[PDB]
Amino acid sequence: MYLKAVIFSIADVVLPLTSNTQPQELKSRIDSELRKLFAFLSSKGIKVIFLTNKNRNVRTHDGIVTLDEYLKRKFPESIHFCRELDNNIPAKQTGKAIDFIMAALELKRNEMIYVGRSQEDLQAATNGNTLFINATWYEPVTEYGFQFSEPKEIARFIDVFCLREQLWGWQGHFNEDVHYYALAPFSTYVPEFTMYSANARDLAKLSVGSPDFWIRYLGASIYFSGLSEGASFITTYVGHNAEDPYKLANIMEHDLKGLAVSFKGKYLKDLFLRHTTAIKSQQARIAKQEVNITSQINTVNLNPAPIKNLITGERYTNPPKLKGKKILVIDDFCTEGNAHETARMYLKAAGANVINISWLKTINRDVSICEPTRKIRPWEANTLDVDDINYVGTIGYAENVTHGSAPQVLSEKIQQYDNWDWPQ
Numbered sequence: 157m158y159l160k161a162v163i164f165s166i167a168d169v170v171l172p173l174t175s176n177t178q179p180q181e182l183k184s185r186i187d188s189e190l191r192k193l194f195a196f197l198s199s200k201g202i203k204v205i206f207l208t209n210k211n212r213n214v215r216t217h218d219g220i221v222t223l224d225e226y227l228k229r230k231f232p233e234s235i236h237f238c239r240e241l242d243n244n245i246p247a248k249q250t251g252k253a254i255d256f257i258m259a260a261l262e263l264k265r266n267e268m269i270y271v272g273r274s275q276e277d278l279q280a281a282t283n284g285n286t287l288f289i290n291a292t293w294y295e296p297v298t299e300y301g302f303q304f305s306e307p308k309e310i311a312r313f314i315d316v317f318c319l320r321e322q323l324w325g326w327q328g329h330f331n332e333d334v335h336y337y338a339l340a341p342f343s344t345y346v347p348e349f350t351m352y353s354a355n356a357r358d359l360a361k362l363s364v365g366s367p368d369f370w371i372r373y374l375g376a377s378i379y380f381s382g383l384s385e386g387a388s389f390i391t392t393y394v395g396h397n398a399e400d401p402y403k404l405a406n407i408m409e410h411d412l413k414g415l416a417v418s419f420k421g422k423y424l425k426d427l428f429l430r431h432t433t434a435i436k437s438q439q440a441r442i443a444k445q446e447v448n449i450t451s452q453i454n455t456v457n458l459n460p461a462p463i464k465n466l467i468t469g470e471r472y473t474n475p476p477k478l479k480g481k482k483i484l485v486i487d488d489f490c491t492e493g494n495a496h497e498t499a500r501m502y503l504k505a506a507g508a509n510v511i512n513i514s515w516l517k518t519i520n521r522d523v524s525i526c527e528p529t530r531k532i533r534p535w536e537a538n539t540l541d542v543d544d545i546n547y548v549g550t551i552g553y554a555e556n557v558t559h560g561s562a563p564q565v566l567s568e569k570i571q572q573y574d575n576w577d578w579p580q
């Protein structure tokens with residue numbers, strides 16, 4: 157399987173620290189929900205690990221016990237790594253404690269995830285290149301998403317996204333620097349199809365799924381397939397309209413920020429600029445006119461001054477340093493690759509290594525891999541002739557659909573997720 161152990165810190169996860177005043181009803185409910193989570197993990201053969209610095213005394217309605225005895229009594233069959241009890245264990249903050257746990261359990265790094273809340277635990281997981289699961293049931297977080305508001309949500313995430321062999325519905329490579337992934341195949345070639353709700357009165361603004369569903373799908377599939385390893389940036393593509401280019405990003409920004417935090421990366425919402433309104437590729441296709449990649453190349457470029465501080469709005473003063481950096485590029489659906497190949501062309505010209513990820517792969521359409529014959533100056537507007545494109549190869553649809561993947565399988569995954577409850 158993919159997930160073999162879950163590391164839990166204690167502060168504001170198993171026992172509150174920040175607040176004196178957590179209601180007893182909350183502690184009892186969290187204790188009971190953690191019991192369910194650990195039993196669920198045990199039933200799946202997933203180990204439960206506690207990682208702590210101090211063997212502090214804990215006051216019980218029965219008396220005072222050490223933290224080790226407390227955890228052993230309430231959550232038996234967990235494995236407690238406590239620096240005070242084992243001088244072997246290196247520091248948490250630097251990520252070294254994760255290396256130690258990996259060796260002790262004979263597990264690979266991305267065979268574990270890390271549930272925490274304290275800043276030291278976020279640092280421990282990210283510096284240890286382990287997926288961070290931000291537990292916010294004792295202390296809330298407002299700055300970004302990809303959160304987990306109660307223990308049940310961790311079980312939901314694991315059960316829905318982390319236990320099946322196929323993390324991607326479609327995936328393929330070309331040459332050595334071209335890597336394409338999509339979560340699920342889907343029919344996008346119908347005049348009716350749109351990824352965004354038709355009515356602004358709906359609280360759901362995506363037509364398929366929801367932000368919670370998609371960020372958790374993305375996070376699981378990217379992490380357990382190894383794509384997050386060494387990734388510095390995550391970014392989304394831009395819509396065709398120069399007046400409204402950030403529709404997907406505006407819906408998903410909150411969650412993409414949190415996924416970036418969990419990978420020790422940065423979400424660059426406006427790394428791409430749509431400087432001139434482009435032909436809408438989907439609409440050209442339904443009009444049965446051919447889509448040419450220069451319609452994208454000639455209307456987008458890399459933003460030399462993206463937002464560096466999504467809280468403050470402060471922009472980079474010099475273009476972000478992308479040379480030698482790994483960037484995850486997200487778009488909603490991929491048909492023939494015009495959008496992703498343009499994203500890749502610009503980022504590759506800036507020296508980056510690129511991973512092209514989509515929620516959906518259009519059924520029965522192959523991706524054409526392109527390289528420019530005119531040198532791209534990626535931080536400014538470029539204008540290429542159709543003859544400036546070298547079509548070097550193909551990532552086909554049919555041969556790269558993964559076993560068992562299908563649009564109906566996505567629909568049932570969404571149903572499974574939306575209605576999820578403790579498996580009875």
Ligand SMILES: O=P(O)(O)OC[C@H]1O[C@H](OP(=O)(O)OP(=O)(O)O)[C@H](O)[C@@H]1O
Nearest residue numbers: 395396436437438490491492493494495
């Ligand atoms: O793989 P491709 O052949 O590039 O096709 C997929 C692209 O087409 C759609 O955008 P579109 O250009 O229709 O504009 P929109 O997002 O503004 O609706 C979709 O959102 C992708 O960006």
Ligand SMILES: [Mg+2]
Nearest residue numbers: 394395396495
């Ligand atoms: Mg688009």
